[PDB]
Every structure is written in structure tokens, then in C-alpha cells.
Amino acid sequence: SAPAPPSGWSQVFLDDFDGAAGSSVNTANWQFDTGTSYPGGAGNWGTGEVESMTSSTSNVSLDGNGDLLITPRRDASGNWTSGRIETTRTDFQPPAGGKLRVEARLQMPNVTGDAAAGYWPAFWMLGAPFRGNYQNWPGVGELDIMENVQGLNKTWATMHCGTSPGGPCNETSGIGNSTACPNTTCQSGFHTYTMEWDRSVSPEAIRFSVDGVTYQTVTANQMDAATWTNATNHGFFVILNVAMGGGFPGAFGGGPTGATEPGHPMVVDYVQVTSLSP
């Protein structure tokens, strides 16, 4: 369960994924992305990933112990399925002068080596104008709070913005970094992945951390005013998924292969949004 926030912070959103084992997610908080694209969006979720997303509890369910499970599955015909859920809410944005923290505590799919090839878990945010549009990436803004591939002991955090390819945000790489999980591997158990959006200073800043340790900071002056405005002057929605294959795993050896093992969930204790007043 989420621990109490620090002094002065208020709760904006919390889903701690409590409920019986094998039961369905709270759809007051979450909506399902299904198939191989948004309705009228880019093919294969824009990444070349090979799974079809579903709303089945074979791919998205609770563990009964306070966690969401998103589990890639491979059927007897060789078809991959997985889960991709987004917050119903799109409003997350601190007021000017304020701060926001968006956080998840999760275990990355516990699989390494050849068996992990293609596994692409993610916990991320997309600018509200993307919803029902699907055609305004990267200008609309993307905050990747945790990404991982290949069961490697590291987390990537990235901001996407501006134009692609290139532009001030160096697309499609984005403004990002990777680091090992502190103390224990990312795959071994829970870690906390946090984005702090700080509108209390000039230049405005976004800081990504793992287990309370900051590894990537992005500041507004890294791009022009219009680019920052387009990327951040709106709410965001939150997304949790495990992609299978596509470009990110492709840059780290590829996958899935015949050796990739299905059935290793991303285990998410909670997603929480908190706010600090100006």
C-alpha cells in the first residue's frame, strides 16, 4: 500500500489495487486499451510491438494482495496478448507555483535473459489532448516515468516533446536517462517510480526518481516557450502496460523469440498522484 505522503502534500488520485485475487480492475479509475491500436491511431501502438491488448483477466487482474497484475500471454497458436490501461482522468496538472508527484510502486516482470526478450513494461503519462486525437505525438508531451526492456536491471525515464525526428527533445530518444534500481534489482520486487512536476521555480522542472533518488531532470529552458507550453500546458492521463516487442526491445537485442516466456506479470501496488500548493 501507498505510505502516507510528506507534510503539506494532498492526495489527488490513489488506486491501491485492493480486491480479490483474479478480480477485475476498478473501471471508475481505469479504461482498457485493446487490440493493436487506438481506434484511429497508429498501427501496432506506434512501436511495432506484436501483442494484441485485451480487457481479459488473463492479462489485467488483481492478485488479492493489493496489486494489479499485467501479464503477457502467448497462446498455443503463437499469438501474444497483454494489458494496457489508462486513467479515466486526464486532468493531472499542478497549478502554477505548485508541484505534482505521479508515482507507482511496482515490480517489473520477473524474468531475465533469453526468456525476457521482448518484455517492455511501462508506467507513463500522455498529454490530455492526445486522447480522441492520437495524431499529436510528441508535441502534446509524454512523460515516461518507468520503462524497461529485456528484464535488465535498470529503469529508463524520459520526456518526449517538440517534433520528431530531432527537435529540442532529440526524438525519438527524448530527454532521458537510465539507472539501476537501488539495493535490489528492478525485477526482484517492488520499487517506487516517481515524477515530480515543479512549477514553483523558473525555469520549471520535471524530475524523475526511483526509490526517492533523482536520475533525470528536464527544465523548461531546454526548449522554446511554445514547445514547453504544447508539452505541458494541460492535464495528463496515466498509462500502465506491458508491451511485447517493438522498437525499444529492438535496440537491446530484439524479441519476442521462441524462447520468450509468457506469464511474468508487472506487479503494481499502486498509482498515486499528489499535489503541493503554491
Ligand SMILES: [Mg+2]
Ligand atoms: Mg496496492
